[PDB]
């Protein structure tokens, strides 16, 4: 128990001053309207997640319906509809190459779909397993490698063709509910019940950094586009942000008005705008520097399930729980 | 815009298929299982099943560490909580009941309670008065949407209870109760 004591003493001794003092002298953003510019309907149940492609035009969304569908966002057309075998999928993905889709959830098995088949009908390219808990996120690392985070307190890296997990990650104690990977695809962070966001190196294979600034559980996380920080949302209505080199928490976007938890968070291309989604029928938008609300995004009537920015930052899509996708701008 | 027109037509075809699947889906009246039960359903791995009785479809969701995926089961017609009270573990079942009640997102989703495996209780064993007393203890704990207790064909019970739940919900929608 002495080792952790001296570790925490050294960590607290390496902090001199906060960035709040150095930020109050900077120009703020004022207000952003961010009115709906497009809507997507055709689902029959609550959308659970969605993820833009690397081209920032196509998107894929899955719901409790039992089918995940791929929209061409510019013209609202349904490019594809995939009739999922199991009705319980709690995540999505869209490979950077743009050829494969991913799904998983209570089925305990991850499914990889191949869009660019010889025929015009998609199929399960690879139904790969090896997890004893429900899957939270299945982000695509590359064409043939996928990183998954299951509820068994461990997260895995899977080789698509072979099937077996190349690398395991067993550093946690609770179930990881949210996994995100850096744009450089070299590191990735996750959070679980134990309220400890862990940063992992893909090649190292075991935990590189840990953060314990929260209380209840890290129920949503996302990465900074620069690649040296990440912001998370918990059940404490807290949007605590952490850096990487300093290993210490920077500042908190906490408002006592919200008592419920968070659903998802996301940044902008510049990074000086941290969108977020709450259970109180609204999407508050923060500012990652002044920590002051700069507007609201209220156009839904149920829980805002997953909100995500595009690669080029032209839009944000907020798949909600009322069978609707909304593409703002 | 020729290819655009053809893409629009294909999207319209996909939307027609989606409409047909919606017509199918709205007539399912899905159910959740919580907590023997294998005999009830037949007559880790989720054993989702489709069974039709009296020209009415039903979707059973067969399903211990408590997680958040219970919240996503918001639109279930009813939750059948099975309990083989052969006994400690009963108090764990009561704790699960309390967690379901306090989930704050399972509200307005009715829960049916089943006291099955009466043969096991009889072999373990007025004694009928004693089993009624332990049942009454279970309801007393259950006092802490409305729950439907059941103690002894079970498919008929769930049929009647689902009919009552949907009737009460539709009466609530039109302000008749």
């Amino acid at each position, epitope marked *: 128990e002495q080792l952790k004591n001296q570790i925490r003493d050294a960590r607290k001794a390496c902090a001199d001053a906060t960035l709040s003092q150095i930020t109050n002298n900077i120009d703020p953003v004022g207000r952003i309207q961010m009115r709906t510019r497009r809507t997507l309907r055709g689902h029959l149940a609550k959308i659970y997640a969605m993820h833009w492609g690397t081209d920032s035009r196509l998107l894929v969304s899955a719901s409790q319906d039992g089918k995940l569908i791929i929209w061409d966002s510019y013209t609202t057309n349904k490019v594809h509809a995939i009739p999922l075998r199991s009705s319980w999928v709690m995540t999505c993905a869209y490979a950077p190459s743009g050829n494969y889709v991913a799904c998983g959830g209570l089925d305990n098995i991850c499914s990889i779909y191949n869009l660019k088949t010889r*025929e015009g009908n998609v199929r399960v390219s690879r139904e790969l397993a090896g997890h004893t808990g429900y899957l939270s996120c299945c982000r695509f690392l590359d064409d043939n490698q996928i990183v998954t985070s299951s509820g068994d307190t461990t997260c895995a890296l899977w080789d698509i063709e072979t099937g077996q997990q190349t690398t395991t990650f067993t550093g946690h104690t609770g179930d990881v509910m949210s996994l995100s990977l850096a744009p450089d695809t070299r590191l990735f962070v996750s959070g679980a019940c134990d309220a400890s966001a862990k940063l992992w190196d893909v090649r190292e294979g075991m935990c590189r950094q840990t953060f314990t600034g929260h209380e209840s559980d890290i129920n949503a996380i996302c990465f900074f586009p620069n690649g040296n920080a990440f912001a998370t949302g918990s059940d404490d209505a807290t949007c605590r942000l952490f850096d990487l080199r300093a290993d210490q928490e920077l500042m908190t976007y906490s408002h006592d008005n919200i008592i419920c938890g968070i659903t998802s968070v996301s940044f902008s291309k510049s990074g000086r705008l941290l969108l977020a989604g709450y259970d109180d029928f609204n999407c508050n938008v923060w500012d990652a520097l002044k920590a002051d609300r700069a507007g609201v995004l209220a156009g839904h009537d149920n829980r805002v399930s997953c909100l995500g920015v595009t690669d080029d930052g032209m839009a944000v899509a907020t798949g909600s729980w009322d069978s609707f996708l909304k593409i703002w701008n | 815009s020729a290819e655009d027109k053809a893409a629009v037509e294909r999207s319209k075809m996909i939307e027609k298929q989606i409409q047909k699947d919606k017509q199918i889906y709205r007539a399912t009246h899905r159910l959740l299982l919580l907590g023997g039960k294998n005999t009830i359903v037949k007559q880790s791995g989720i054993f989702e099943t489709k069974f039709q009785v009296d020209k009415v479809n039903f979707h059973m969701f067969d399903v211990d560490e408590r997680r958040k995926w219970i919240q996503c089961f918001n639109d279930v017609t009813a939750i059948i909580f099975v309990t083989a009270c052969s006994s400690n573990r009963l108090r764990a079942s009561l704790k699960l009941f309390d967690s379901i009640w306090n989930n704050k997102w399972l509200r307005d989703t009715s829960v049916i309670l089943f006291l099955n495996k009466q043969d096991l209780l009889a072999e373990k064993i007025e004694v009928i008065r004693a089993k009624y007393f332990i049942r009454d203890e279970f309801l007393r704990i259950s006092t802490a949407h409305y729950c439907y207790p059941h103690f002894t064909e079970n498919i008929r019970r769930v049929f009647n209870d689902c009919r009552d739940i949907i009737q009460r919900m539709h009466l609530r929608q039109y302000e008749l109760l």
Partner: single-chain antibody
Amino acid sequence: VQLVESGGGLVQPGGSRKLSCSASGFAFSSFGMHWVRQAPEKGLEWVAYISSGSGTIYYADTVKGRFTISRDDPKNTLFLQMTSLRSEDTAMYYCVRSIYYYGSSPFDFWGQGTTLTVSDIVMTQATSSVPVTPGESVSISCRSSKSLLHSNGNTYLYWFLQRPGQSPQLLIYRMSNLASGVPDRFSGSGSGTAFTLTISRLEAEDVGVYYCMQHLEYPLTFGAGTKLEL
């Protein structure tokens, strides 16, 4: 995947005949289809097209009143009906699949073909035969009467190089992209009014006749041709 065409023969003018296409290997219900006939000494010519659900059906403006076309998904067969034919319709036919969505590659596969015997947008393939030497870039040019650039930013032009003895193949779609089973040597370029296809390394399989094709307009006229010699 496989397309098999049946029918044809020799019939005196003013008659009728049914041609059939059996598709085996893919879910062709969600596949638009085209018929393209080629004269023994002329280039390919459009005939008719059917959508996925046989909802939208177009026809060749030259011959529309004497042609019938239909399809049966459960019977796995799409057929065409010719009536009151003339000496002009002495040509061998092709059965073509195509799928239409963002990122699709229409005219992906061409059927084997069966034989039969008895202004709007036009292109200009002025060149006919340009022999080349190994290890040298080969360029083939085509032109259009109206600019093929749309408001979306994609130019609807296709290339249909055909090997000497078999069905035509799809090489370049949408004026920039590349089909699935094509070597990287073939590359399309242009500006929007004059288009070209360039090959860096040439081999025996590269010998063929290259055809340019338009799609802004559903009549879908397609261009005249150019032989390759080695």
